[PDB]
Structure formats: C-alpha cells, structure tokens
Amino acid sequence: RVDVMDVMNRLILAMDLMNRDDALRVTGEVREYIDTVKIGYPLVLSEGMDIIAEFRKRFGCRIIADFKVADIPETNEKICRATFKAGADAIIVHGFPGADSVRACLNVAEEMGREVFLLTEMSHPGAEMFIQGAADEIARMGVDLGVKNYVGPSTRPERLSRLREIIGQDSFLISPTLRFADAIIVGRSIYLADNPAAAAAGIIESI
Template sequence: MEVKNKIILALDVPNIHEALELMDKVSDYLDTVKIGYPLVLAEGLESVSKIKKKYDIKVICDFKVADIPATNQKIADVTFQAGADAIIVHGFVGRDSVESCLESARKFDKEIFLLTEMSHPGATNFMQPISMNIASMGVEIGITNYVGPSTRLDRLKMIREIVGKDSFIISPGVGVQGGNARDTLQFADAIIVGRSIYLSDDPVNALESIIDSIEL
C-alpha cells in the first residue's frame, strides 16, 4: 500500500458532517484515511462507503478485530463489503483468529494490518511482552502489513527487524501522544495522525507543518 505524503489521517470525529468538512479541507494532501469506531458507531458503515466514494481515497478500518475466528470473519466480511481497503486486526487473540481475517481479505482482494503493539502507555502492561511474538506470527502466516508504535522507537525498530524491509508498517502516536514524524519514518512506511490535525484551528496548516517536518 502506497501512502501519499506518508501520512494517514485518523478520522476519529463524532459525526459524518465533521468528517466531510475536514476532508473537504485536507483531501488534496492525502490518499489514505483511518476510520475507527467513533465515526462508524455514530453513523454506521455507510460512513466508510460515503467517504471512499466522495474522495476516491483508501480507507483502513481501525476495528482492532479481536474475537473468535467465526466472528472475526463476519466482521471483516461486512467491513470489506462496505468498501474498506484494509482492516486492522489484533494479534493477541491467536493465529486462527488472525487467519480468519486474512481469509476474508483474500476473498475480497483487500488487506489486513496486524496490530503488534499499541502506542499508549498502558500497552506496556500486557501487549509489550508479546508484541514481538505477534510480529513473528504475522510473518509465519504471510502477513505483510503491520501496526507499530511511534511512541517507542526502540520497539518499532525491533518490529521492523522481525517483519523485514519489504513489509509495510504504519505507526500511530505521532503528535499529541508524543511521537515524532521524521524519527518514526526511519522504521515505518507511514504515520497515523489524528488529533494534531482534526483538533487544530487550522487543519491544513497543521498537516502542512507535518509534511514539512518530514521533508526537512
């Protein structure tokens, strides 16, 4: 997956009106957005279809799928049917649950991103001890897309070493959580940025500043 300007917008706004208003301002700079539960729970999966169609943009659904295989596959199926290009899947639930999402992605000619370790402080409690095992499992079953934290570059570097240079890593935590865009891109292929853009009084200027920092 190629990502324009190496930036994925986390579109975690509470309604479709705010989502469309923001996209009208920033869509010229982006070709990929991440849509999670806040917008989909408020507006339904139609929000994915609407944004994808209006802006001709790639959509990664950040549902952090984490259930038994049969339920995981149902979630992935309806998400891809709504137009999503990829879905983010938790790895801690085990190989069979992850493989069910991978099977769905192959059926619809879509992609999954395997979440190895999250970017918030609490991830160190339970996720960090197993995150490298999750990355290794992903490699074993043929996954080529991963999520790793920009807030812990030492961990992100280790994830890169496990998944290899040809895998595609997207990294949340840049901006409000403290991750640095330029530093993160030493190990990741694209960064995920949300609040630094959509909470800004001038989202375009905020986005341009991030792009400038990357290109320095």
C-alpha cells in the same frame, strides 16, 4: 515497495471525529495532502457503516477500518466480510487472540482482494500489562502467516527498529519514525487544528 499500498505523502489521517458533518468537513479541509484515511468504531457506530463508501466517493481515498478485530475465528470472518462489503480497503486486527483468529481475517481479505493490518503493540499505559510482553511474538506470528501490513507504536523509536527486524525490510509498517515506518498516522494535530490544512501541509513539509 511495489507489492504494498502506496500512501500519498506517507501520511495517514486518523479521522477520529464521531459526527459525520465534522468528519467530512475537516477531511475536506485537508483532502489535497492525504489519500489514505483511518476510521474507527466511534464514527461508524454513530453514523453507520455507509460512511465508509461516502469517504471513498467524496475524497477518492483509501479507507483503513481501525476495528481492532479481536474475536473468535468465525466471528472475525463475519466482521471482516461486513467491513469489506461496506468498502474498506483494509482492516486492523489484534494478534493477541492468536493465529487462527488472524488467519480468519486473512482468508476473507484474500477472497475479497483487501488487506489485513496486524496490530503488534499499543502505547497507552495499560499496554505494559500484557501487550508489550506479547509484541515480538505477535509480530513473528504475523510473519509466519504471511502478513504484509503491520501497525506499531511510535512512542519508542527503538521499538520500531525492533519491529522492523522481525517483519523484514519489505513489509508495510504504519505508526502513530519514517526511518522505520512506511507511513505515519496523524489525528488531532490535524483534525483539531484551527487550520487543519496548515497543520497537514506543515507536516508534509518536514516529511
């Protein structure tokens, strides 16, 4: 789809290592296979937000900030602004705090020319308690607000098809499958592999 991001090889690296040397080194080993990297709080809190600009300059990659933004609207605005100022191309935001909290993020993203990904569901066991039951309504909330980028789980394929039905065929969907999602997110299988390149290149072979 032209109006949503192009992710090289439909493979997003979840760079969840917490030290700068390893994150930069392991990312380097697989740089030829991916142009989009997802980073989260453990890395940025440990090493500083300046690491975002570092990735983009050293590897030329898009950065998705997996910050699971989940505050009140005013605070969400400030988190998004700081994150985009640091160079992030996109930010992942929770839907459970409701529509105004999501809209706050969309406002800043539109202002600054960046993207919001709405996290519709999670797949860790505790997600059954509240998240699973809210997933469909959160996805619909996103659609109603004009959200064009979504994160959904891959552990249950039939959940991905359901998400697709809600968000439509054109919105961008990434999942941690490619019949429904536009790109897959892979972390450990790559960054822990004794040969990250052998892991990455292999995954792209199947894709």
